[PDB]
C-alpha cells in the first residue's frame, strides 16, 4: 500500500465486459457516474492503482477519510469521479504458518498529499534527539509486516483494489466506447448511419 503502481491505458475505447464478471466483488459503488450508462462518454486517459489491504481497512480508501492508511499510505482528493473495483484474495495471499511479504508505513512527519508515493526507508524521530542511525528510545522503525494468515476472520481478508481514474483533459480524446453494426440491406430505400455521414 505504501508503494502503489499506476498504469495508463488509452488510445482505444473501454470494453470492460470480458472480466468473467469478477464473481467475488463484495464492493461495487460509483461516486460520480452511473453504472448503467457509462460507455457513452469519451475519455482521454484512464489510470488504475494496485495494492493490497486488510479487511478492517476497506472503507478507509475514500474521499474524506482519516486514519493511518488514508493519510500515510494513500490519499484521494475530494473531487473524484469513478467506481469501486475490488475482490478478495484470501486463497492466494496466505501460506503455511503465516505469510509475511507485505509492508506498510505507520509513522511519518505529516500526511501525504493526493497522488503521492513515498518509498523512503528513513527512521522516524518522536522526541528531540537525533536518531544517529541507531534505534533507541526516541527513534522507532516506521515499517512493519501484516501477519496475513489463512486461519483468520473476515476482518483480515486481503482486498486487491483497482482505482479507476477516468481523465478528460484538453487534448484529442482516446478512451471512448465500443460500437456495434447491423447487416447490409441492399435495394431498399432505408436510413443509413455510417461513421460520419447520415
Amino acid at each position: 500500500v505504501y508503494a502503489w503502481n499506476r498504469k495508463r491505458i488509452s488510445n482505444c475505447v473501454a470494453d470492460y465486459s470480458v472480466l468473467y464478471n469478477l464473481a467475488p466483488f463484495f464492493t461495487f459503488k460509483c461516486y460520480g457516474v452511473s453504472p448503467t450508462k457509462l460507455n457513452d462518454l469519451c475519455f482521454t486517459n484512464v489510470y488504475a492503482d494496485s495494492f493490497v489491504i486488510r479487511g478492517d481497512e476497506v472503507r478507509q480508501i475514500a474521499p474524506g477519510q482519516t486514519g493511518n492508511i488514508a493519510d500515510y499510505n494513500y490519499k484521494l482528493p475530494d473531487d473524484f469521479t469513478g467506481c469501486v473495483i475490488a475482490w478478495n484474495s484470501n486463497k492466494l495471499d496466505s501460506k503455511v504458518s503465516g505469510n509475511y511479504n507485505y509492508l506498510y508505513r505507520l509513522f511519518r512527519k505529516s500526511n501525504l498529499k493526493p497522488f503521492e508515493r513515498d518509498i523512503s526507508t528513513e527512521i522516524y524521530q518522536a522526541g528531540n534527539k537525533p536518531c544517529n542511525g541507531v534505534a533507541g528510545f526516541n527513534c522507532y522503525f516506521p515499517l512493519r509486516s501484516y501477519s496475513f494468515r489463512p486461519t483468520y476472520g473476515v476482518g483480515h481478508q486481503p482486498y486487491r483494489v483497482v482505482v479507476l481514474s477516468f481523465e478528460l483533459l484538453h487534448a484529442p480524446a482516446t478512451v471512448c466506447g465500443p460500437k456495434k453494426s447491423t447487416n447490409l440491406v441492399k435495394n431498399k430505400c432505408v436510413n443509413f448511419n455510417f461513421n460520419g455521414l447520415k
Partner: antibody
Amino acid sequence: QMQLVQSGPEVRKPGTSVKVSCRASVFSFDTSAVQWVRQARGQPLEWIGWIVFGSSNTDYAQKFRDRVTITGDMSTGTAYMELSSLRSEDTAVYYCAAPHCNRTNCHDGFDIWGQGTVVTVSS
Amino acid sequence: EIVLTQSPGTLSLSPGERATLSCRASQSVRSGYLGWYQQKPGQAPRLLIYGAYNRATGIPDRFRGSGSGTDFTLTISRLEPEDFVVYYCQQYDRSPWTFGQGTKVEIKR
C-alpha cells in the same frame, strides 16, 4: 493530574502464573511505552522490561526472556505482565512507569510513575 | 552491557553547604540519554534530571547537572534539608538498561 493506577498486593503459591496490570490513558497514541522495574527491600533496581505499543519489539535482560513475558493492548489501554516459575526470590515491589506522549511525538524522559505492587509467597 | 559504578557511598554534610555526587560508567556512553531520579523510602520514585542538561517541571532551581562523555556529576546549590533520600542513575542509551547502587545522604551531628 496525569497518574497511572496499579493493582494492589497479591499472595501466590511457590510457582504459578501472576498477572500485574497498569492502566492508563496515554496508551492509545501508537507511540507510548511502559517499563516494568523491580525493586526489593533495600536492593536497587534490577532490569528494564519495556514494551512499545504498536510495532511490538520486545527486549529483555539476560536473566529474563526465559520465564517472563509482556503483552500489550491498545483497545482498553491496559498493559499486562506474566511471570511463570515463581521461586523464593521475587518478593519485592513492582512499579509502573510511562512517559507522556502526544499523538505524533513523545517526550524525552520518564515523567509519570505508578504506585506499586507487593508480591509475597509464604504460608 | 554497560554497568554503573557509583563511587560516593555515604556522604554526610550540614544543612547550608554544597554536596557533589557522581555516577560514572565503564565505557563511553552517549550524553543524550542520561536520567537522574529521586526515590523516597516508602513512596514512589520520580524524575529529577533528564538529559543531564535540562531540568524537569516542578523541580526547584538548585539541582544542577554537569559532566559529559564518561563521567557525570550532580551539584547542589543550597543544602536545604527536604530530600535526604537515596538517588539513582540510569543510562537508557544502549539496549540493556542498567542502574546504580545508591547514594544515601544523612545529617551530621
